[model samples]
Target: HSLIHTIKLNSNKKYGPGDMTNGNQFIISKQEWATIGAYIQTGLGLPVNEQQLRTHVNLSQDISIPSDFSQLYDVYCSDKTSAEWWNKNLYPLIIKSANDIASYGFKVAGDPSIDGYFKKLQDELDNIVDNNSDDDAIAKAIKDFKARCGILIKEAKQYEEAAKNIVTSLDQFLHGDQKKLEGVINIQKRLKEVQTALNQAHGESSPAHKELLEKVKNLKTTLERTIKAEQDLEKKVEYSFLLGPLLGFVVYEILENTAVQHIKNQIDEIKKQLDSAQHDLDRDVKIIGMLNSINTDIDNLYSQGQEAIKVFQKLQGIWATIGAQIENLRTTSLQEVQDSDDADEIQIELEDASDAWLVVAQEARDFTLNAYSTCPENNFMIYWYNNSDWYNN
Candidate 1:
């Protein structure tokens, strides 16, 4: 082939220290380039110019180089060129350095490659808080908190039930003392109201109120003829409602704290991963898969934790109100009953307490799910990606 007419390789091409004509060119074996070029020519819109190919000995004039690579290596060593430069040149060292940086990212990021999808979200959450004065924003925040609290409510309910069962066992051990029986009577009445609220919220008939109504009604019939020992039990019963809320409050606190901690841990882990992958990882491997898994994991865990939080929040609120109502029934309603044996008036107040608490639980649950619909994970991520001008600027 004639040198000018046939595109002959320029053997003495000079690439200045500041220029990237040589650094941009990677060393690919002739056999490897031939095999890789077939696929690259088809897959990439740009075609490979194989006719212009040349060995390291025959440097081309038109090839571009990465200037950063030369600048980085020149900091540690001289830029003198020689015949034995392949082993002495900075290219091999530069490749090794690039690989090391990528490897560091792989270990810290939980994957070997660069992934910005989940990183955007992780960064957004780290910066923006959900609390805002806007109605929509407040509502959304409420919902998010509720989702986190739903499970707490269920757990609190378990504790409530357990407290109830423990008090019942105490009743058997003490033998229907008038004080304890009266306490049962009060709780039974309140439990009815709780059931009614549950029914209203769910649009279904609640057996909680009706069943407790029957049991409280039965107690009143037997309670009317109480002697000395039975009267003593009734006195004890009036004080029993106090125990329910106290026990419930403790359980609610424990579960709520646990949920918050887990969410914090997840956020921290994600932030660490994002920080590493963003500034590092040139090309380690397929990091997209691991990042996707992390995204899904975070979403699921957040959802679960949120559910429990909602439950606890509502339960705590309801329990506070219920306690107040019970106090009202004890002082006002019971005071009214001193002259007569009628238990109906006392039952009404207990009903109110139960209903109030049930509604609280239901509303918290509904609000929590509503927050989930807004999908904080997605919204926060978008905001993060766009707002992260700090890094580039």
Candidate 2:
């Protein structure tokens, strides 16, 4: 058919998944429709006009659009013809690449659209969440988080208690030191008052007053030793108390907050991957089925072509036999029979029969196979050698 018309437009420079848009850069114009007309005319040795070219342009433009690689793939899946092309060509290639990825414990989903992938992941996660309601791993994780918190709290309490103890001991040491100084002041006043009484009583009981001052001096030495021991005990409390609980807190924080968070993030990512995996699993099967359908259509077309060939060959043999009989009846010496009307009538009837006999075959053979060649193989060619033998009777 001649192209009805053409339209003009610019290429949008859309690229494919691999940006292989350079070689087959389609010019987003009515070029295809116009080319269709040009091809038909050239193919059939016919003529076309500018008006037909314009029409083809409009038609082609309506049929084509600029598309990126992913978008193009989405179209291929949705469009039967393109899906067929993929089945016969692209499916094997994509499967090969995906298989290799799988071998390495990685994956690329067959049809990786965002919504489809996420919905798929959510479904998987939901299943896992349901099935693993009593999952030991998750239970362990949560328990671990809580356990670490407990460890941290325990350490904090230990540290807090130790700190309080140190404060209390320091207070005891200070208080004892203060008592010793007060005792020293009281002894000095007692000594001064005893000396004053002796002076007033002259020589009476002077020896007794001296003995009392000596006793007070001896007790002050004992109080200083007790104060020194309390100070040493306070030092021990300050130096050793903090190290235990602080270390425990650090360990628990690493396990619960940092390590636990890392694991949680990993699970989330796995969830995403699994989601994509499920969607692709279904999509790939659907696409494969679509491809198979296209393959079936191809077989049908091939079968039809084979049937047409058989019909044509049958008619050719019949016509050739008829012509040979006509030749045998003719002689150069005899006047030619004026059977033109009969021959014309026969020709009209044959044309109708030929048109009616043009049914395509059910079984298909390749165009270049022995079955389709001019000298078809005996296996495919039906001889029917008994046909005219019965006729000769």
Candidate 3:
């Protein structure tokens, strides 16, 4: 069967025939080709009912499977000629392949309709085994089935690469800046003062004070609304303190109005006092800087915790694959002494792999759970001291 056509058939709907071709030669990546090949081998083990093919095929959302590819099932019209019959009667090769592929797709990709294009090869093997065509024919068929397992193991490596990429991308997203949050807090404090002034002015009867109170109230409402709307990390830093000009103007107006001037005069005296307490403000800045650094450390720990979760998940996938391959070898083996010997060799290899699999799985599970529990404490502690006292100290 053509490799290009095989990739087109087995790839998920996101990829199409155009994806498998670069001008003339097949453009399918080596990892993708291996993945598709494994699926094809597994598809060969299932019954070739036309309706079944139609049901199991996953096609691109925008493109239907062409007639030429769909019509190839005509070659396996007879149940006698199909691996589905062999799986149930002569040996269990075909059904095992079907199970392996189904399980692989369900757990790994979350798709069950991934089919393979290995009809010609499986048919040739089936014909040879049914007729007892040659002594070497049966051996060749077993070798080919074993080769599919080898291909699946190779494809597992690609998943490791994909898991690595996920962790790295997550790390970049989690390393956030604390300065933006600090800026928001400063704006919040300023708004609180404006709120207090508006409340006092609202209690008074003067029309001028009432108008000033309304302007300040509207400005505070707009600033708070804007901050909440842009609270997503993407633009929060840039837009959080965006009411600077409006705030400066309101402060100027409050100082000019004698009725509101009482509060403003107190603020002016406090500002002069704060000028003498600049060293205390500098000390608070240092504490904020330390908190920001700790926040980075916390983020890094959280990223690692997430990465551990992915590792455990990927290891679980590998364990599932290894179990399927081992079961396939055991179920399909001929019961002769030589066949048992070959099966034992496979069993030994699987056992060796199983040991390491458990080790890594244990490590990942422990790390993931522990890191999740520990990371919150490592995060920036809330500054309980008053901002006024912090600056003065």
Q: Highest lDDT: which candidate?
A: 3
Listed per candidate, the RMSD to the true structure in angstroms reads 40.5, 53.5, 28.2
Give the Cα error of residue 274 in candidate 3, in Å: 13
Model 1: lDDT of residue 160: 40
Q: Rank the candidates by lDDT, best first.
A: 3, 1, 2
C-alpha lDDT of residue 269 in model 2 = 40
Ranking 1 against 2 by lDDT, winner: 1
- List model 3 lDDT by residue over 16-36, tens digit each: 111222222222122222221
Residue-wise lDDT of candidate 1 within 1-393, one digit each (tens)? Answer: 131211113211111001111112211111111221221111111111222111110123343433222221221111111101212321233223223222322221232243321232222222223233445643454344334234333433443443333334333222323431222223223334433443243312234333332333333233222211121110101101111100100111222334433433443343334334322121110111111222222232234223323333432343333334334433454345433534443344333322232322232223222221110111212232242221121
Q: Where does model 3 exceed 4 Å of error?
A: 1-125, 128-136, 151-279, 286-290, 296-317, 323-327, 330-393
Worst 10 residues of 2 by lDDT: 359-368
- Write down the lDDT of every candidate, Cα atoms only: 0.26, 0.24, 0.31
Task: Write the residue-wise lDDT of candidate 2 on 31-90 in tens digits.
Answer: 111221121112121102322221311112223222211221322222222222223432
Better of 1 and 3 by lDDT: 3
Q: Which ten residues in a row have the lowest lDDT in candidate 3?
A: 234-243
- Models 1 onward score TM values of 0.19, 0.17, 0.25
